[PDB]
Symmetry: C4
Subunit: 390 residues, 4 copies
């Protein structure tokens, strides 16, 4: 007391609804007096008492004089930052956790674990922080580019599970899982199955026995690699999601990849991190996913659901369950997380809405949140409200 936390049955509900928008650049005008941080790759993770809104900053504000380089991914300035969910992530409201150009975090019931990867591309370093204390590291194993989830890690009974990967962006990237306890890496887990390229896994609990993840293959396919990780045996297997509703971007037309479930198909090169979250019921499991409305561009974001079945074997379309972001608006990375009610867990999906005007201006993002709430159908979409000219 505090005790370790475990996944619980989800709170009652049958549809997602628009919850909250964090749009810091609504206050970034030259005519204004604010200092929203320039960020990308936001995610959210919650503990028993609060939710934290994380991102990777370029250590620059709007308005400001350091826009050059903010459309790049890795440099010596990027840091993992957070605010309490609902606060605007400005220079003063934010806290800087560690130097990082790839990140994750999660709460185990007693304390926060923070994860940050930095260093040179060919010998990068994963760093683990438990509360205030730097407690461990893990090294690049392919010497191409070590990296992690860009979303919440997952803790059960004090054991926090985390995807890492290393490899070429356009070739092989075989992922691993780390088992981390009170900030220290106590096991490495080497998945079996379809392992040729797995990155940016969005993971969560299907049950007390099983973690599942929906990931990105940046090289070979528009189907998402789907991880099943058994936390009783510490073993993992990966296969492609068979659904006709391909969740990557870019992607070919739904159902158009012919042959069996493992077939790679066309337009596999490139990709995007995708939302995935679980609705755990007594004898039923809802799997909720998001994908861009556009097949080729990072525009729009749609929500989908399927109950039960085996995602490795089932070609049936996921059920469309609403436009979270219309195709007129940006829809970039998406992620899952869960908010802890008094006796049950609330599944949510967050959406990174990038403000992209190219390399000659600033480059950052808003965060939209949708959560399971009540019944019926999803009723309204999200806009950032930002005019990049101001």
């Amino acid at each position: 007391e505090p005790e370790w936390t475990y996944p619980r049955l989800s709170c009652p509900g049958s549809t997602f609804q628009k919850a909250l928008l964090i749009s810091p650049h609504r206050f970034g005008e030259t005519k204004g007096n604010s200092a929203p941080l320039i960020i990308r790759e936001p995610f959210i993770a919650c503990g028993p008492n609060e939710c934290k809104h994380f991102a990777l900053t370029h250590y620059a504000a709007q308005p400001g004089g350091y826009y050059n380089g903010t459309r790049g991914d890795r440099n010596k300035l990027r840091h993992l930052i957070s605010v309490k969910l609902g606060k605007i992530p400005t220079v003063e409201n934010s806290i800087f956790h560690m130097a990082a150009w790839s990140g994750s975090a999660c709460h185990d019931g007693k304390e926060w674990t923070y994860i940050g990867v930095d260093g040179p591309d060919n010998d990068a370093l994963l760093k683990v922080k438990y509360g205030e204390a730097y407690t461990d590291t893990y090294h690049s194993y392919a010497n191409k580019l070590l990296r992690t989830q860009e979303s919440a890690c997952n803790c059960i009974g004090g054991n926090c599970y985390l995807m890492i990967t290393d490899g070429s962006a356009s070739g092989v990237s075989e992922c691993r899982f780390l088992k981390i306890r009170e900030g220290r890496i106590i096991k490495e887990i080497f998945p079996t199955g379809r392992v040729k390229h797995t990155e940016e896994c969005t993971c969560g609990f299907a049950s007390n026995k099983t973690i599942e993840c929906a990931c990105r293959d940046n090289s070979y396919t528009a189907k998402r690699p789907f991880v099943k990780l058994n936390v009783e045996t510490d073993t993992a297997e990966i296969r492609l999601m068979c659904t006709d509703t391909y969740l990557d971007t870019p992607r070919p037309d739904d159902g158009s990849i012919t042959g069996p479930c493992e077939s790679n198909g066309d337009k596999g090169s490139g990709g995007i991190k995708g939302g995935f979250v679980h609705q755990r019921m007594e004898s039923k499991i809802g799997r909720w996913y998001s994908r861009t409305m556009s097949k080729t561009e990072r525009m729009g974001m749609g929500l989908y659901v399927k109950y039960d079945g085996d995602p490795w074997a089932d070609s049936d379309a996921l059920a469309f369950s609403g436009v979270m972001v219309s195709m007129k608006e940006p829809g970039w990375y998406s992620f899952g997380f869960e908010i802890k009610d008094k006796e049950c867990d609330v599944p949510c999906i967050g959406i990174e809405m990038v403000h992209d005007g190219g390399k000659e201006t600033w480059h950052s993002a808003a965060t939209a949140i949708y959560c399971l709430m009540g019944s019926g159908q999803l009723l309204w979409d999200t806009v950032t409200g930002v005019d990049m000219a101001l």
Copy 2:
């Protein structure tokens, strides 16, 4: 540790006095360095330990570049925000609770309940949040425009009661009440009586048995619909206030509506949300109300009181208690709320003082507060001090 709260006897006193002004736009000059949020529909709710100042933001600051649209009511950016009462609601001080263009909130003794309506006009959606967790929703039942109080909900023994309404702004809007316990709707209450238009109810406890509300009829009368809700039987009845002192704006001359108490009279179309709060004594009930100084414009705010009687039956004029805002200053929405002293409750009325310069400039509000304190007569009025040209 902690216990559910109940209404208590009011603290001793016999007059209201000027307490506190929150005027964020005193700091919004182009020459300044601050970021007060552009808001409307402020209200206040208190729990056992603190009071919170809530409002509906347009997700824009002064100074800034997003003034266009701030004189409108509903859009995809409006959010329910709060600060601790006494803090200036700026970009950084504020917390964003949820997307909402109509709102409410209340503390039950253990935790905050937050209420926000958003969605499209014909199928809007009321959302309930308990602490950090989104917990329930309620649907549009007239498909016209679902909406709520714009003031505090009211909790007793863990059951929080909330007015909602749905229907045409210039036609029929039959309200209902929701009973919400730990974030979930456990009962609907369908009022009887004079029900054809009730909105923006300002509600409080007359006793442990009864909640009363003074509301707005936007279509048919300048008399306020007056709700009596029995919390023991979970039933409600509504009739017009019979007092000659018509509390709406616009309104005709006092007492000039002829016929029985239910007669509607002249200047019924249009309206304004009105202040109302109870002073609960051992063998006596005081009802305190506010209305604009102008009969037809949102200018000034006067305080009135009457002890005992039946508001449905008594045509007696309310006793004029003093000028809270001069007819030279804006007087828009007003609301009641109660502060928890150690052993008794302090009744207060808040006043929204809108800065209205038309649709070619920014549109926002200050919040003035008067509370029951000491004896004698009300001594001083409130100004916003804001020059909209700066």
Copy 3:
């Protein structure tokens, strides 16, 4: 637990030293990005866990557009505000307690009592707040200008004692004391003796039996009225301080008021609020006082001490104990307060250092703090560092 607090023996020490400067206008440049509040009449009060830095704001920031009127004393915008001692009192860091143009506050061991006077000059109103709750008021008794200390009130065993006064600035102003318990006025105390003009009393505990105050006579003398208030009998007597070291400004030459201790003497018109704090030892009492270095202008601030004797009867000079502010710098109001160490109390004097460029610019103040610490002599003076042109 929390229990009521009482004055304790003072911590060991024999000289004051420079502790801390709060100079918010060091960040008020047009070239800067900050919002220090425009204030005057600062004071400090501490409880068992923290110290609060209070002041009276004009509800305006530097830089800003509302400088006009900030060299005035009373208006409908002035408010009592505070920050945690050590924080810069800006728009966002501060909290607004109540509308007030005269103020006081104190902690009783369990909760804060806040005191604010506002209203029209001829019928002003003292308002009492206990925590968040407005709990009582007190009315003007001379209908000239009700006002209070502009420094900490004093609580013992739950009873908080407060000076109020009412009367002409250039004639009679007979003060009273209020005894306030958990926010409610439970006794009025009418002093005897030399009562013709007593205002802006700076008060503290000489012992568990006695509160003493050093006050301002704005009409008749440059000697300070000295209150002795017996908290066992709730009786008070006032006589002039007899010391040759006249503490008011303006003042004639030291010792130059001829005749007995009660003689008024010359240059009595005008005045200033003066610092006074107690050093309580086992069989000895140190009385520490401050006065401007200039006899006629609000420039400089010197510290003085005398041990034992009767301030009503003793003409001996107070011992000069250091320049806190040189005559080159502003020295306006001064006040006493005590910080609570684990087992003993630390006496301190604070100094308002007003930035005065006349009525055509902004008008505000810094706060300097000196406290009893160690042995020897007071070693360094304080400057605000502010160039009013920036």
Copy 4:
């Protein structure tokens, strides 16, 4: 509940890695909206629950109008400030602890002790604060310039140990140590041995019996004076570090100082505060140190280590562990500190990275942090990212 803290065994690890950069002036552009404080002499200290980032401010922000004087050391405006480690030290985020132009701080397990020296050069004064209470002072003993560590003090079983010194910058400065318990000085410690110039000691626990410090000789040598302080007997001895790897700046070529360990050698005048921190193992002690990459300029910062031996006697070169700051970036003061994990202590070194544009512009610093974490080799360097023209 709570207990006094003691040094514990260090957490497992064998290399340092880049942890965190605090670079406030990334947000100080004329085009921006922030107010980073102008500071120098940053350090860090941690207690059982949080780490605090301390520095000495010139009481001025960037952008602003008070740059003149910010390249000086001592004045009446300098103050010791802090934020929680990871927050940007701005006007509003920071807390001002006391007036000080030399500083230290440390947590004893129950409460913070804050140390600040101010006053005139010939009779300066060290002030001790415990929590909010000013509790003691210490006087100048050489009347030249009393000063302290500019890094964390060290507490064991409630006794906090602090280096102080006094004397000429280019002549003799014989240091002493103070033993402070709950804010009060309970013992003086007068070192023996090589005492002619010791300042800016960076100190830590070698064990429960022994504190060690690596210090600056500004007059006579580029070898660092090295303190061994026995906390059981409260006595101290000092001798020069014998290592060929001279840690001061300026310095001659490594190993080029001929003669016995106490020989002073070439380029003795001038100096810099140096990083030093212990890695305490069961049967082994690691000593980690930092020095600039340039022999003569404050450019770059390299990390070094040696296990066991006697630093007074061993001429052996320290093992070069990696580049923390490239010779293209500023490397000024460095310091050691330790973070408290649940059951072990994590050693770190911090680096002040001064933005030096000469006396015609602003002068301030970023703070970079490296900590022991994992195994392998140190992988990445730190840049401030600041363009002083913006």
